[PDB]
Amino acid sequence: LDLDCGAPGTPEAHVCFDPCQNYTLLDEPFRSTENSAGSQGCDKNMSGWYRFVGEGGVRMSETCVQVHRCQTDAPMWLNGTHPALGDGITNHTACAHWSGNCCFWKTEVLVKACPGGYHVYRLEGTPWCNLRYCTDPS
Numbered sequence: 001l002d003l004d005c006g007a008p009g010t011p012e013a014h015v016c017f018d019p020c021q022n023y024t025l026l027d028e029p030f031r032s033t034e035n036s037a038g039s040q041g042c043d044k045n046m047s048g049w050y051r052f053v054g055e056g057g058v059r060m061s062e063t064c065v066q067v068h069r070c071q072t073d074a075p076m077w078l079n080g081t082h083p084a085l086g087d088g089i090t091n092h093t094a095c096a097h098w099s100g101n102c103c104f105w106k107t108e109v110l111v112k113a114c115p116g117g118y119h120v121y122r123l124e125g126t127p128w129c130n131l132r133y134c135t136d137p138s
């Protein structure tokens with residue numbers, strides 16, 4: 001529920017940790033759903049847990065984002081509702097909007113609410129490029 005210990009019976013199996021206390025911090029305003037920049041990158045290298053802060057927003061969007069936002073081509077949003085503190089690590093689908101289809105690609109993401117009023121996200125690459133996990137500045 002509360003801890004990430006790695007995949008059982010695998011080399012990556014490791015000491016358990018609380019994601020709320022072991023994440024990569026990203027302050028990348030270009031992830032904003034309101035960023036229209038012509039540049040396009042890809043989150044293909046993401047791994048582990050992430051916390052988003054700054055002007056771009058502190059959470060993923062819960063609604064489909066228009067294409068060519070978040071400094072990417074196909075933006076990714078959370079096809080679910082954020083958990084409350086106490087719900088533990090929750091399993092969700094992230095959807096990428098492309099070619100008239102708000103879920104043209106999909107992938108699993110984990111989400112946990114944390115003491116202090118923030119969320120962390122477990123993000124393992126992307127299913128295609130150029131895709132990125134957006135943040136909603138609202």
Ligand SMILES: *[C@@H]1O[C@H](CO)[C@@H](O)[C@H](O)[C@H]1NC(C)=O
Pocket residue numbers: 014015016017022048049
């Ligand atoms: C933090 O997470 C990384 C990636 O999952 C892991 O390799 C590392 O052992 C963790 N560190 C601690 C202190 O739990």
Ligand SMILES: *[C@@H]1O[C@H](CO)[C@@H](O)[C@H](O)[C@H]1NC(C)=O
Pocket residue numbers: 079080081
């Ligand atoms: C995912 O999005 C679809 C389309 O907007 C919606 O019908 C469905 O209920 C959503 N799923 C969750 C778990 O929110």
Ligand SMILES: *[C@@H]1O[C@H](CO)[C@@H](O)[C@H](O)[C@H]1NC(C)=O
Pocket residue numbers: 091092108
């Ligand atoms: C999340 O749900 C999918 C679909 O049921 C499943 O394949 C996957 O193993 C789940 N992830 C975890 C960590 O349980």
Ligand SMILES: CCC(CO)(CO)CO
Pocket residue numbers: 003004005006007089
């Ligand atoms: C996907 C399972 C698990 C490890 O990868 C998620 O944190 C369980 O600890």
Ligand SMILES: CCC(CO)(CO)CO
Pocket residue numbers: 026028042043044045046047
């Ligand atoms: C540091 C995060 C990142 C670049 O912003 C590289 O993994 C995400 O794509």
Ligand SMILES: CCC(CO)(CO)CO
Pocket residue numbers: 063064065066067097102
């Ligand atoms: C109504 C807006 C939208 C869905 O949220 C489709 O045009 C944006 O992707």
Ligand SMILES: CCC(CO)(CO)CO
Pocket residue numbers: 085086087
């Ligand atoms: C809904 C009950 C409960 C688990 O989700 C709230 O955190 C009880 O611990």
Ligand SMILES: CCC(CO)(CO)CO
Pocket residue numbers: 073074098128129130131
């Ligand atoms: C959304 C993917 C793509 C479409 O032209 C742009 O990165 C490349 O296949």
